[PDB]
TrEMBL record, chains A, D:
Species in which this protein is naturally found: Escherichia coli
The organism's taxonomic lineage, starting at the top: Bacteria, Pseudomonadati, Pseudomonadota, Gammaproteobacteria, Enterobacterales
GO molecular function, one term: ATP-dependent peptidase activity
Gene expressing this chain: clpP
CDD domains attached to this UniProt entry: S14_ClpP_2
Active site residues per record: S96, H121
Protein name, per record: ATP-dependent Clp protease proteolytic subunit
EC class (word): hydrolase
A cellular component term, taken from the record's GO annotations: cytoplasm
Role summary: Cleaves peptides in various proteins in a process that requires ATP hydrolysis. Has a chymotrypsin-like activity. Plays a major role in the degradation of misfolded proteins.
Cell location: Cytoplasm
From TrEMBL, chains B, C:
Complexes and interactors: Component of the ClpAP complex composed of six ClpA subunits assembled into a hexameric ring in the presence of ATP, and fourteen ClpP subunits arranged in two heptameric rings. Binds to ClpS.
Presence of the UniProt keyword Nucleotide-binding in the record: yes
Assigned protein family: Belongs to the ClpA/ClpB family.
GO biological process assignments: cellular response to heat; protein unfolding; proteolysis
GO cellular component terms attached to this protein's record: cytoplasm
The name this protein goes by in its record: ATP-dependent Clp protease ATP-binding subunit ClpA
Keywords in alphabetical order: ATP-binding, Chaperone, Hydrolase, Nucleotide-binding, Protease, Repeat
Nucleus among keywords: no
Length: 191, 370, 370, 191
């Protein structure tokens, strides 16, 4: 049950849920496995905040174990498109398509908590049918794989070959190791 | 030149007699020269002196002293007000433009709105400006003009009053000091009717009083300060990272000041928060003031750089400007010496030495009776 | 010194006449020595004396009489207010800095916001502070100043007033008593407009009347008592661990008071609740006050220490402060005495004893008329 | 169903759910298995309280049987990040990542009821697949174990060796025994 928090304004007092109150402060929450429905809310939230104040930065807390690759791209495409710089904070956990969004944040406004952990690996999928259909479906996984590494290399700044070999298998990176890798600029000990 | 210059500046008389007054005085000035009428003919640029003298405004062909004063006034303000360089530049450019001869035909030299966080040099930069320029500072605390009846006293006097001291407080002051700095502190508190007065000032440059006297605002600097949206500046966001609420504060300024008012303002300056490096400069400023007070009592004070840095770390608060630093100076420097000055070794002579104790992170005071 | 001191303190006259005033008067004083022109030569010290009389401000070179009073000021106040040593230090030290010459250039001696629970000496410390220094107490009840029209009186007169009296209650009072204690009790109740009026009173130390007279707050101690967040400290938190609630009052202070107001304040001292140990001292104060009332009638009171402890336990309530202690003393001591004083056994002077009996746990009164 | 309560105010009467009313008094309930979703609610509540009063001490009633270790770290990071001292109380049981949050409270504010029971054990997790992947995931749990021991040592004050040997197997600690270990400063029976 989400609690209701009272917000006091000169006009009067308005009761909002805890999540809505934080949304008013440009704080979006990316929780749970990535999906189209939950991503639509994140996308819808970014557009509303961008209009209210396109200059102000938007913060996107990220505590996710990963999820659908395509759903996350909607969020990623909306972050680069809008003018507000979308800051990203990795609270608790970040995984495939959760960490990609973390590094996708604007330069100098990406952070990780001191005890946070982040993981990265290649997209996982499968298909069953005739060999001809499996070839095209399999080829698409490579296309997104190569495209994903190009984006991560762009944000992290590392060589494409380094990400390709690292992404191949699962790699658990602690918060300090992420800074060396380039996923985040520093740790959020305090502002 | 006399007729053109006189109507432009002399606004208290009609054109025929006004022109003759400049021609008669010009001849009087030439005959009174110590030399035996060397400048027998009345040439151009001499009449400019007479009109400037009659109108009590700066003349053309600025003297080397004024040129040095305006050139030197790029750092002299920066030696008392640190940071906020963009605000100082706006003030000096308006002054430099007007004295150069390039200025608004009927508007003032400059109209500025100084908004920002608490404890920044919004007012101090204005006060020190008048001192650097050697001109009278006209102050008007707008917290006393919050009611409609009080605002009527600025433009003129209420009809009911039978007192012989008629005339407005702003019109009389401007006439007394045409070349001056007009400070409207906390303008947001004032009644909106005040805006109707300033709107015609920044647009026309003259405010006729109830008596009918004409006040010229061409040479008067207009600087008004405010704390609109200041609450947003000190407000902390509900998040891990505190966000910059400067953009939101500007919206409040746009709710109090109509677009026409802001459109007529030459600039709308926002004062940035004081940085750590700046605080060290602010500490030295307060330390100097302390030494001056002590000099009247024959007491000398020397503070180590380490102690100065320690005072900054304790008193540094970005949200609360530089006023907290003053409290730190009072608690750690003035208080230990006040007890010693009244009843103690520091009756005279001084030779004080302040230094930090790293082991206990506390300053050690040394008093010499001399 | 004459031109420097006069322009600084004497702000109602222009410099040529103003400076000559302290010169001409210093000459008359020099020739009026006790026997015959003791000190023919005039010195800077004599000028300071004349300036302190013209401006009615404390003179420099504080005599030993004042020093003794200042050093013992904290101890004297401690004998009246118990448990608020932090507040006394701020008031006493600020006063010492001003007299010693380390006060603010143009700000007041001290601006303080005494916020605390009920019955903690927020107003008693300020009332007794004036008696210790022998200066007039300017007590302003801010509950009355709850409407915008009322605030106008503080700096002016109501609109449409035809009488000669165009003065304000705050400007005139300060002018009559420049060295005084200004008390604004329960200022939070007052309309927010009053806060805007005091901004110039702290930052600049001057307030301008509607007529234009400029008051001087450089020597007036400014104290403001507020009960902000009183309901919060009264209520107990919904939790296993009760909360302090002292911080909650400070968050309400931020809401009621604008940031510029709080930044001007020298310090915000939060008065703490009275401990059981200090309540014993309060009982002695009330009994001593009762003895003074009884001495006029000619009767002397004697109360055993065991009785005093019982009264403290009966009236000890942290949330309700020290006011209940008066009620238990009034009910237990004043009520029986009144019945006798009015009707027998106490008309004439007679020693009376009050002692507790452990068996009945009730006070015993022996009138012993004489 | 959750009951509703009336809060008396000068402006008027406000209706709040029982949980939201307690939130107004800086009381947060950590009940149930730790998860990414419930942790965000606790995290959002902590951030909201910080804005209302960043100096007053927050309270957290921990009555959970443990859960996802990574989600709990989101709450642990926030507890030390925010300036308020997050007091912790133990109602009923406390288990892995429940006790870790109970001992993470500020010194002098951690408490336990007389009958509250605390349980501490090492993280339990499993992964199946290729041998290379098992080694990577296995190393992570070992690294996380050390972080748990290191963090608990700071709060409890005991050496890593004592915690390492004791945490190898499940250890139940009553309220008096827990105080000796250092999880909590004292009991709430009399204050
Ligand atoms: N930038 C600065 N450099 C040096 N001293 C400063 C600066 N800003 C403030 N001060 C000091 O702080 C005081 C001046 O504060 P002001 O500039 O008058 O504040 P303000 O801008 O009017 O703020 P309000 O009251 O919120 S409108 C003096 O004691 C100055 O010495
Ligand atoms: N700290 C104290 N020390 C000694 N006597 C005290 C103290 N506080 C209160 N008293 C006694 O109680 C009387 C009344 O205290 P008040 O002046 O009403 O306190 P206050 O805190 O100013 O009250 P309000 O209601 O909060 S404005 C004083 O005159 C003393 O007799
Ligand atoms: Mg100002
Ligand atoms: Mg009182």
């Amino acid at each position: 049950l989400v609690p209701m928090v009272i917000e006091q304004t000169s006009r009067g007092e308005r009761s909002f849920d805890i999540y809505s109150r934080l949304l008013k402060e440009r704080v979006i929450f990316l929780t749970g496995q990535v999906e189209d429905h939950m991503a639509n809310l994140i996308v819808a939230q970014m557009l509303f905040l961008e209009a209210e104040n396109p200059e102000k930065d938007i913060y996107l807390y990220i505590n996710s174990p990963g999820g659908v690759i395509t759903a996350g791209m909607s969020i990623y495409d909306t972050m680069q498109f809008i003018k507000p710089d979308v800051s990203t904070i990795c609270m608790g956990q970040a995984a495939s398509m959760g960490a990609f969004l973390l590094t996708a944040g604007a330069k100098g406004k990406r952070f990780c908590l001191p005890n946070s952990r982040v993981m990265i690996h290649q997209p996982l999928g499968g298909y069953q049918g005739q060999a001809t259909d499996i070839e095209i479906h399999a080829r698409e996984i490579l296309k997104v794989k190569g495209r994903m590494n190009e984006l991560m290399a762009l944000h992290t700044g590392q060589s494409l070959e380094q990400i390709e070999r690292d992404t191949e298998r699962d790699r658990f990176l602690s918060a300090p190791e992420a800074v060396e890798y380039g996923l985040v600029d520093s740790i959020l000990t305090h502002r | 030149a006399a007729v053109e210059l006189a109507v432009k500046y002399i606004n208290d008389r009609h054109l025929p007699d006004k022109a003759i007054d400049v021609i008669d005085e010009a001849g009087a000035r030439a005959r009174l020269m110590p030399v035996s009428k060397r400048k027998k003919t009345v040439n151009v640029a001499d009449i400019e002196s007479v009109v400037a003298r009659i109108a009590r405004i700066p003349e053309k062909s600025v003297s080397q002293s004024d040129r040095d004063t305006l050139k030197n006034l790029g750092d002299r303000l920066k030696m008392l007000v640190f940071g906020q360089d963009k605000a100082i530049e706006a003030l000096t450019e308006a002054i430099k433009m007007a004295r150069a001869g390039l200025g608004h035909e009927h508007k003032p030299v400059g109209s500025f709105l100084f908004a920002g966080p608490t404890g920044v040099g919004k007012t101090e930069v204005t006060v020190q400006l008048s001192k650097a320029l050697g001109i009278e500072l006209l102050r008007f605390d707008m917290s006393e003009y919050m009611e409609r009846h009080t605002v009527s006293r600025l433009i003129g006097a209420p009809p009911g009053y039978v007192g012989f001291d008629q005339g407005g407080l702003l019109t009389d002051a401007v006439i007394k000091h045409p070349h001056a700095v007009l400070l409207l502190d906390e303008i947001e508190k004032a009644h909106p009717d005040v805006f109707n007065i300033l709107l015609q000032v920044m647009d026309n440059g003259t405010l006729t009083d109830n008596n009918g006297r004409k006040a010229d605002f061409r040479n008067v600097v207009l600087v008004m300060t405010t704390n609109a949206g200041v609450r947003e500046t000190e407000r902390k966001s509900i998040g891990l990272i505190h966000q910059d609420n400067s953009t939101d504060a500007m919206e409040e300024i746009k709710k109090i000041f109509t677009p026409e008012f802001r459109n007529r303002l030459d600039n709308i300056i926002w004062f940035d928060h004081l940085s750590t490096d700046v605080i060290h400069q602010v500490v030295d400023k307060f330390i100097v003031e302390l030494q001056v007070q002590l000099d009247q009592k024959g007491v000398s004070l020397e503070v180590s750089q380490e102690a100065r840095n320690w005072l900054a770390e304790k008193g540094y608060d970005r949200a609360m400007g530089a006023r907290p630093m003053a409290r730190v100076i009072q608690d750690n420097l003035k208080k230990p010496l006040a007890n010693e000055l009244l009843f103690g070794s520091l009756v005279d002579g001084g030779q004080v030495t302040v230094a930090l104790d790293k082991e206990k992170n506390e300053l050690t005071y040394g008093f010499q009776s001399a």
